[PDB]
Design a protein around this ligand. Sequence first.
Ligand SMILES: C[C@@H](O)[C@H](NC(=O)CNC(=O)[C@H](CCCCN)NCc1ccc(-c2cccnc2)cc1)[C@@H](O)N[C@H](Cc1ccccc1)C(N)=O
Length: 426
Amino acid sequence: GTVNWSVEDIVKGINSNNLESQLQATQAARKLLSREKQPPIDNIIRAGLIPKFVSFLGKTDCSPIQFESAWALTNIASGTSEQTKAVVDGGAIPAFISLLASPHAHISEQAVWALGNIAGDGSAFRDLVIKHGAIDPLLALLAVPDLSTLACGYLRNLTWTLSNLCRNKNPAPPLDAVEQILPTLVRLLHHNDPEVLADSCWAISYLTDGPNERIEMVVKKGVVPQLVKLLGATELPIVTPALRAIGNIVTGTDEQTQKVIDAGALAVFPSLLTNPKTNIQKEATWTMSNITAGRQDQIQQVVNHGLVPFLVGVLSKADFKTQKEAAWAITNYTSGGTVEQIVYLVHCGIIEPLMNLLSAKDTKIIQVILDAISNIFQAAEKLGETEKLSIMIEECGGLDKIEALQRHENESVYKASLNLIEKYFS
Ligand SMILES: C[C@@H](O)[C@H](NC(=O)CNC(=O)[C@H](CCCCN)NCc1ccc(-c2cccnc2)cc1)[C@@H](O)N[C@H](Cc1ccccc1)C(N)=O
């Protein structure tokens, strides 16, 4: 009986002095805003309905209209940024926080979902939600001895909303709020529900997307072994953020990187570096590029796990963005590796695919490769084997690729390749 109302009818209903008529119009409004094709959010907004919906949130005496208006507002707040703003400007945030305490689960859950949409909109709304004190009652809802006694959908919404409080940058969330949330998050990260695990991983991946101090704050909570385990999951919705998170951690200090290696991450990388999903392969290689920028003993652990041939593989054939990542991994490896580790690199076949990418119409990857070639010559210099390396590069057609770079637009390149020609090619 609340199917297909017009906005004018809804307004008439909501403007009556009759709580039941209001409830009926609100429900009608909810159903409109729920329809799949082009819900008329903006018409609803233009009709001045948000303030009325928000005031309906306070009707403790009429829980069904609390629920319908929460749902209606939620549909609106899950739209665009201006639509979300309209919900925030109607005073929704404290009214939703009050509803977290509702004795009716379906109402509390709706409030959880609404705050998640508002906080997920941007840094400023996220921080406004935190300032209105959302975190304490959100965490209080998860304060049970075993998470398994909570309804599955309920727990998924809470996790999702928690992950939005961790999301976005400029600024990152307040340090205080991260610390408040982190222990619950570590807990959710050990729960056995794929979606809760996915969203927990996303949350950790956001918190580790920053300066080493923020990375530290997560890593000191001991999540890395669990991340590595999730890194080995079969579900792509779990692997993807676990790898993003692991990728962020290895952009940190050598000590933070070492915890990733100690947890056994490198054992998962043969499958990641050959993963059929392009973005996994790409982020796996990025991750390697940060590990090969570590200490020589960390480069050595890459060698020991048999990962150099997989780096040669990615460099040889892959999506171009992934190959760019592999080039970095190589330059970083050659930059910091021992002479013996660089010799090993060449013996694995790095030279030919390295040269084939000198044909890439991209300035940065050329600089990166030319830099790597230079590092390898510097290793050959310490062994007096510069000439043998020269013959190697020449025979796989690499020399012609380098002379052609003499004839190149950018001159950071141009001149790097001429340094190479003069110095190592008669
Ligand atoms: C831009 C650059 O500053 C960010 N990436 C880093 O790895 C930063 N790391 C360092 O500077 C280390 C610290 C040493 C760490 C010690 N363990 N020094 C050696 C080093 C130098 C250069 C590279 C390099 C540069 C460019 C590309 N690939 C690798 C890697 C290591 C950027 O790529 N971030 C991603 C982008 C992305 C994420 C996922 C997929 C695709 C892209 C993101 N936030 O989404």
